[model samples]
Target chain A: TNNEHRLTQLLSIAEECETLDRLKQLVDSGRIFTAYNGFEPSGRIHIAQALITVMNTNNMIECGGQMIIYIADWFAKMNLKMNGDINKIRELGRYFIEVFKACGINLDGTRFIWASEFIASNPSYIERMLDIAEFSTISRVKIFYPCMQAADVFELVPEGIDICQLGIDQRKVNMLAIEYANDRGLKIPISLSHHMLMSLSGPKKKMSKSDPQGAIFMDDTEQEVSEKISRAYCTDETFDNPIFEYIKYLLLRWFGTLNLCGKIYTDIESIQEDFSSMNKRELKTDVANYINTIIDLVREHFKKPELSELLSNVKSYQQP
Target chain B: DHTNNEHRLTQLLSIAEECETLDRLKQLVDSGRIFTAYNGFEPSGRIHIAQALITVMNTNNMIECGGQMIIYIADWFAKMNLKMNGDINKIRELGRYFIEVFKACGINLDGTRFIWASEFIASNPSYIERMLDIAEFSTISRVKRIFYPCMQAADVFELVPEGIDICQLGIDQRKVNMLAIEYANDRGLKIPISLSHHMLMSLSGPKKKMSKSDPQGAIFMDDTEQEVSEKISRAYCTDETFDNPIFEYIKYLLLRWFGTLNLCGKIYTDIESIQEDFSSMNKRELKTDVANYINTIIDLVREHFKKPELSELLSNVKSYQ
Candidate 1:
């Protein structure tokens, strides 16, 4: 029972981790530094990205890792050339913070740092860097530098943090931080792992924060989850099925075992046994039921009166 | 009739005196205050005897009058002229000559500040910039009216620290020296006085300023004993008049060496009495005696030229290559 509980916890945590290597490292290390990836609140938060938000924070708490949630309002402002609706961005920032709190993640050990705080407090740091950087040719600068983001990392965080967990797409931006640390002769923590989640649409397509149909929402009701799952593309082949892939990710791959619920299963043979045992209607029902339970909890935790209220508030243009 | 003309001439010379009010002169002289007089030479030509004479006379007068003299070789001006002439090395060689000439003049030059304007100007960028600012304060037309004259004026005013009085230079430099006095006055200085030489001319030409470039225009201290003889032999003169260049040079420059003119006059009339008694007196003999007198001057110059140090000094003081 102890092994089973450990296995179940590992499954849940691993399924949330986008990268298998990172999940394995976290499980092996027993202690990890985790990051909550949130973009600037210039836009809305879609339902699908809520899964990552919930899972990432939950796993961080489970793994005994320290969490750093970035209010990337400044990065968003810069990306929009600082011309975006300021009120909208601020509102979104508040919403994202509220969502994390609703996920039942502990905030005592977690840091909530804003990118704007670094910008405003240490402007001269950016100015000096800009002065030296301006002398560099445009061709080199465009490729080598990204405004003030590189310096912002060291300016904001502690000197020797172990890990920087960001989305796979943010790899380029994070590389600048590494380069800056090396160039300035500062001891920077190694970027140990990156966890990138796949899209619910298919394995080949990634779950984009921007794509509406690419992911599942935390606020989806039982009916909505069942409808979306029924409509989702899946093939009879084990490899191409999005539903099967999600099941493997959320259950078997995460646990590092071939067991789900009280069923004793192992390897691909057991995975096949679990797969054939369930009818498509029954599988949809099970997924819908599981998702609905989470939605109900999330709605209560987020202080929404009902699931419908939460769902209605999830805007169309909101990123996952 | 001759006595009347002589008395009238004495009266005319007295009337020509535009000397500073004696009271101002005495106040400046007796103040025991040290003043700075600057003399700048554009080293565009050889350091001729005329230039040497002016330098010696001005330095001697300043030192005697209790003032410090600053001798400036206008090397920048020389270089500019050389650059215009398409020869820079010549200017450098000329600059070396200026240093030498100052030493050869037996000037107690230890107290004198020798400055090369080009080097000084080049080293002090801020000072030069300040000068340019001062220069810009004047309009172009105003600058034209005061250009060359104002340079010496500005030099005296700007180069000298305050509380100084007298500036001495040659009669030819009176305009520039006066400008210096005006500049000092404009800057709230007490009245500054300028001292100058009475006009003196070349040894062998018309009554004009002695110029180094003209072979017939001036006597060079570097002239060979034979060359001096030849030049003096060819000098234009008249038997009846004392207006001849050679005779005038003898009366003015050379005469100063044997004490004052009155003593020399007493000696001259004694010689005339001997000539009267001899009755067979020939003008040729008198001319030969005068030539001998002039030759003695030539001998003194040649003797000074032979001294290695003095010769070296003269060579160094020459402005043009």
Candidate 2:
């Protein structure tokens, strides 16, 4: 049995979790545990994605759970990315898998499924998608054509799911699923979200590849990371403190009570407690170093020759 | 080439749009290819008088004018319209019943092609894409909420890439027809000369629109002869030729269906005579003649499908959930 505290940790990892009771039982039972998180694989691979998802997948894996990564190629098309060309959109999805490799996501139990293939092949998936669409109007529409990712929840109803660990943007969509399932007397999938703080650009805009300084790219050079993170916006004591959030949400998890670049933290509490004391310079320096360290370790794993074949072959790859 | 009787083709176009664009009709009839026509119906109920009578005459006339007719059975649209209880099962049986209704209305099955909308759509996903394309092209409106309008447009494109020469539809369908026509123009696809034929005035009164909701509003082709007679006798058939239900029915039934109007042991071969002489006839006498003509049309169709096997199938037909 895994640490009961870490079991609760996965439950509380996000900004909100609607009914932790659902995932609590699954995590303790030592049975198959499934959590879903989706990605839009278009444009440059970025750091915010890696930082958040790496923790999520590992948390589930550590808790003896399956983390299913749904690549939203349909979403990329809807978002007007790469002119809706699915070939390159899928290529970007392959690139995302490579980044995940660098991020230390265990490919063993972590499953990857694409929306275009799933939607086209599974008729009931679309039926359920439309059925959920009626629960909300174009409100479900998003950068993900699969949008409001709540469509995935209702579709995942029959399929297995224990937790839905996603960023704060999934809050609205996840709420839709909970509300719909509650109203219909259907079994609701347990929803969990993380502290997906706003972009370094500002509180108003979320992290995006559209702006380089807005969010850190996973492949950002050491000099570029230092420059962008230095210019990155941070609030003194408010939740807008991206630097504190980065440490609290992302950094403390790498174990053995590590201290590098003049900072030390054993857990989230040890780190969150000092979130107020750390100045922007001190915080920015450490978050960047840890990010670079994580990136450096996974870089060699990503450079694997077999993964290169996957980049060009994502469209024709065998179904999950 | 002999079918291009300029005078004959022009006269026949009257039943659909009735010489509204005589020039276009003449040119198309001269610009010979198989004049493909698709007349749509949501087979939720029996064939109403407008479809059974006027529509048949249009098809016969179009065929005579070198046309190939496709009776587009809108099972998918019927499902969209909440007809047959919004289930394909109910939507499906209505198709067979309608085929019989057409047979019962003297529709020569050999002369026309019958196609089910859902089966065609299931087979061709691209068909739905074309429909979705129209839905995207048009600016948002309350009309957009209704899906079959787009499907109907796509059906035309899928059925005939060259475009339907003539589209026979109810007056209410002009909005959708216009949408399709404008879309075709926008896309530089083939354009159809859509016909907004006279909807049968409700038998309930001249003020009412024909709908199955008012059971006595419009007569069905399958209605019993006595029921047809009772409805016709009570129908609004005033001497005011304009917007007159009986006058509309008589003109559509005779000119479109039967070339000769046989009344009181006399046959008038021409529509001009029926139009001119009907005014002198007593209103009661006219109703009697109308009932006789309607009965004759209905009886011929019934007679055509009167075989035991066909009769059993027709009788066995019922709605499914």
Candidate 3:
């Protein structure tokens, strides 16, 4: 009973986290540091990444945390080793930046950093850091903890900063940063997220941005979203249905409520009963309608003519 | 300025400076033409009596003949000598002694150029390499035919810039000197005449050349006056012929200077006549006269050596000043 109550409390806390109460506590602590997330500008911003971009930054800002969203164009260039294609990376960077703004994630207390700008501005710093690291052996590099990720963490918060947050796969890298800082006689704080969201195809599979069928896009038309959700797999048990998982993650995770097709459920079992009684077509329609509403809100925010011009101005502003 | 001393020696000898085949010594003096001369030292051992008699005397004779002289210090040859004997320090000291003896001789070497073959070879490696290339253009036998002789010939041609007309060295070096003349001919340079002196035997034996390593075999300049006398007295000799040590010394070292058969107008053609006439003649005698002659040259060298300032001055003079 205690464990269940604690789980309920954590769920409620995650939900209330969307509202800005946790943010108030962080601000009150007077120790909230910037949060950094980076994506290589090797491709267009897809649906899954768009969702993450919104949710990650939204929680950060709500928790009074400064956000440092990076378009790692230079790292993309380095990884690809392609010369004379920087303009392509820059274009992708603009799209990602626009998507973040469209999600209503304010940039006033946040800084939109670019990996290319940091590297170009402080080349000697990169060289010094690399020299200090020497050549990490293949075994160390292959231990699923990439040195580049640690380097990214350092870039996010160099010194006198409190917290570092990253995904579960990035856990080893953040740990590496902590070890490195301790070796260098510095203190570093770290946080991690490992919650799994289901793929559009099935509850068993995790959503992959590269797999177009597995995730929804912010730029997806209303009809496209409806068709994708209708085709997505669902089951009699709520936990067995990927669509319900998606709904639980995107909707219930934010609203602190379970409402699927005019039915209300408090627990996972009740949710399953309601979903099992409903037809697949009804479930599809309900999920699609809810997703379309979110997309519409996003498209309306993105389509604002002044918003585009403002983003353009902000990008070229050269902030101090 | 001292024309009288010059004329006295010239008229007394009735000699002319001429570059011609000596008509048994008559033509050598009768001709007025000057002759260029050169000598080579292999920079080994102390400068013994033999070197003074041969190379040193040759240089002096050439200078007296109104010809320019060139001295080749075979430093590379000294390295080869060390390879054979393993006495590098002794050889190096001997090299320095040669320069010292030349200074002591008071020979006006202003017209002379002193050269080290090693220095020449090192400074012009590319040139030597080109020569080697030309040499390698032929077979090994052909290279053998030219290599040793070519080095001597190249030395001769190298002296052409110093304006040498005659090249003289010891008899042991004649083959190389001849090759030098040949190389000059091939290179379209002036032909330098080659001359050599016979090797002087060691005092202790009649077989080998005088050497520094065998203290009993050679008369070194550093030997005390008593030591010189003792060595000469103990030298191998025969009773009634040129086998006598004093007779050989007088014939090769002293009489060779005048190139005349008789001393003071009395004909003493051979050592036999000198030994036979030893009872009557003063200068004509073998032991007394020859010993006196040898002593005179040594005294001159010793006197110069004692005068440190003059020796120092002459030693510091530029090669071709």
Candidate 3, true inter-chain contacts retained: 0.00
Q: Ignoring the other chain, what TM-score does chain B have in each prediction?
A: 0.70, 0.86, 0.67
TM-score of each: 0.40, 0.56, 0.41
Report lDDT (Cα) of residue B107, candidate 1. Answer: 66
lDDT (0 to 1) per candidate: 0.52, 0.68, 0.55
Clash count, one per candidate: 15, 6, 10
| Pairs with backbone N, CA or C atoms under 3 Å apart (clashes), candidate 2 | A14-A193, A14-A194, A15-A193, A75-A145, B14-B18, B104-B301
lDDT of 3 by residue, A267-317 (tens): 656665676677777767877877777667667876678667544543443
The DockQ of each candidate is: 0.01, 0.05, 0.01
- Sort by TM-score, top down from the best: 2, 3, 1
The parts of candidate 1 lying over 4 Å away from their true place are: A1-320, B1-23, B83-88, B125-146, B204-213, B239-243, B260-321
Candidate whose TM-score is highest: 2
Model 1 backbone overlap count: 15
Worst 10 residues of 2 chain A by lDDT: A138-147
Runs in model 2 with CA error above 4 Å? A1-320, B1-5, B18-27, B140-148, B161-165, B264-266, B318-321
